[PDB]
Design a protein around this ligand. Structure first.
Ligand SMILES: [Zn+2]
Ligand SMILES: [Zn+2]
Length: 185
């Protein structure tokens, strides 16, 4: 029900930095929450899981998560709402495989909260991410509330608050503007 291993503060600031560079990288840490529900009936939720997975030499973190989740999952009569905090929006490869997973598991919906964007100026990537955001995933840029939530629940904070780095707000604003253009259709 809780398998969190809290990261260091500096590990958190390293892997969730949000300078909106152009790069093809893949998240190392993937922090996740799993909520139940059922029919579904209005009003959330009841938490059943919170934890993290790590990239492995031949497996991006997103795929290790699908692996773990399908090794767990049982009640096809409940509906699952999954949240991820990741360093980057996923791969084209992972985008494709996530669309596949979502088509195989229609009781599941996924929210991806990313510190910044995977190579945001390739058009096939942008349109692939758009397609995924209507295929049963929500994609969003991590903002101050999600950085605070992450700090509170996945970081060895030891009572310090999260202190934003230089240009935190400009970085976020650009990322959020860009992602809303990508998702606009
Ligand atoms: Zn794979
Ligand atoms: Zn990937």
């Amino acid at each position: 029900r809780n398998t969190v291993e809290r990261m260091d503060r500096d590990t958190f600031s390293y892997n969730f930095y949000n300078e909106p560079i152009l790069a093809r990288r893949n998240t190392v840490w993937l922090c996740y929450e799993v909520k139940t529900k059922g029919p579904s009936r209005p009003r959330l939720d009841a938490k059943i899981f919170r934890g993290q997975v790590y990239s492995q030499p031949e497996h991006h973190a997103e795929m290790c998560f699908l692996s773990w989740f399908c090794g767990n999952q049982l009640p096809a009569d409940k509906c699952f709402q999954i949240t991820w905090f990741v360093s980057w929006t996923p791969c084209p490869d992972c985008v494709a495989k996530l669309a596949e997973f979502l088509a195989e598991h229609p009781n599941v919906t996924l929210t991806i909260s990313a510190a910044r964007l995977y190579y945001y100026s390739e058009r096939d990537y942008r349109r692939a991410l758009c397609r995924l955001s209507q295929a049963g995933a929500r994609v969003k840029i991590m903002d101050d509330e999600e950085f605070a939530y992450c700090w509170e629940n996945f970081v060895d904070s030891e009572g310090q608050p999260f202190m934003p780095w230089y240009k935190f707000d400009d970085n976020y604003a650009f990322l959020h503007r860009t992602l809303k253009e990508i998702l606009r259709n």
